[model samples]
Target: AFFNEQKEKVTLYLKHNIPDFNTVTFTNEEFNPIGISIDGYINNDKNLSFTAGKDVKIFSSSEELDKMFQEPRKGYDEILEHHHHHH
Candidate 1:
């Protein structure tokens, strides 16, 4: 029950945080996910290069995702400023 909820929260991070990506999939072991697959439209080979040697703490909740991307955070600030686009 909780695991499902937890996993959903993880995907929620991708929904908003990674708006550019069309799909976000997680490679999970039981209740925890060890890796993520971000499939970009027109190019499926973009974010698949990310595979962790160990369990990387890639934001499991909205709060953490927000904290991580609340600032520029690389691909974030330039694309999404807070929520909408900015000039």
Candidate 2:
């Protein structure tokens, strides 16, 4: 949970810092995420919004898969280690 929070903080920071990209979304509109997707609002074309998924070749730079492999498996005790969760 701690790492997840850290990741979210990074993601939120990047969303604002990286103008080329908007907020990164891990799920679909219905919350059924077969894979992660990135949504963006490109300049020049005001109506131009982008959604990327499935074809990872284009989005590999995001390293979504790499994160899945690297992230440690977390259990309930890990959450309990924090004071709020323990309560």
Candidate 3:
């Protein structure tokens, strides 16, 4: 009945842009190889609600999507809770 947001698995690149919504650029750092900082859009809900990209390559055999739709808020909170609880 509803569609899911798409995501892409990309390598750490020098620079990348996603329309007038946001921009992903890199810089020279001593420790980190690449950097991702949100730019252009600020205090704008329309642009903030935008996506990264459409063309993605999701390779997973888990039942994550199934549970995502079943109980979205619970699933999201669970993920956050796990992250905060563990790493």
Candidate 4:
């Protein structure tokens, strides 16, 4: 009983203070989160806006993120190859 009571109190404390990310939405029409930095803040309601020429890409999974970098490197080499052919 004592152990159960202690466990209940700990659970209550964590429940009251923890910020839950269960319902987090990463993007909407205006912006997508290409990368996340721990140093930033999101608005109270979780809407983010980027203006003018700003761009971002949201990765939905680890595989998607891997391809994001892979495709760019492939494209970079392709561009260099294309440029070399021109020279």
lDDT at 22, model 4: 23
For residues 23-84, write the lDDT of model 4, one tens digit per residue.
22223323336432111112223332111112112112233222323232222224335556
Give me the displacement of residue 73 in model 1, in angstroms.
7.8
After superposing candidate 2 on the true structure, give the runs of residues whose Cα lies further than 4 Å from its correct spot: 22-87
**Which has the higher TM-score value, candidate number 2 or candidate number 3?**
2
lDDT for position 53 in model 2 = 40
Two-way lDDT contest, 3 vs 4, winner = 4
Full-model lDDT for every candidate: 0.36, 0.38, 0.24, 0.27
lDDT for predicted candidate 1 compared with the true structure: 0.36
The residue pairs found clashing in candidate 2 are: none
> How well does each candidate superpose onto the true structure, as a TM-score?
0.36, 0.25, 0.15, 0.23
Q: How close is candidate 4 to the true structure, as a TM-score?
A: 0.23
For model 3, residues 1-49, the per-residue Cα lDDT tens digits are 1112211222111012222323432222122233222222212332332
Q: Lowest-lDDT window of 10 residues in candidate 1?
A: 50-59
Error of 3 at 46 (Å): 23
Superior candidate under lDDT, 1 versus 4: 1
How much is 15 displaced in model 2, in angstroms? 0.9
Better of 3 and 4 by TM-score: 4
lDDT score of model 4? 0.27
> How does candidate 2 score on lDDT?
0.38
- Candidate number of the best lDDT: 2
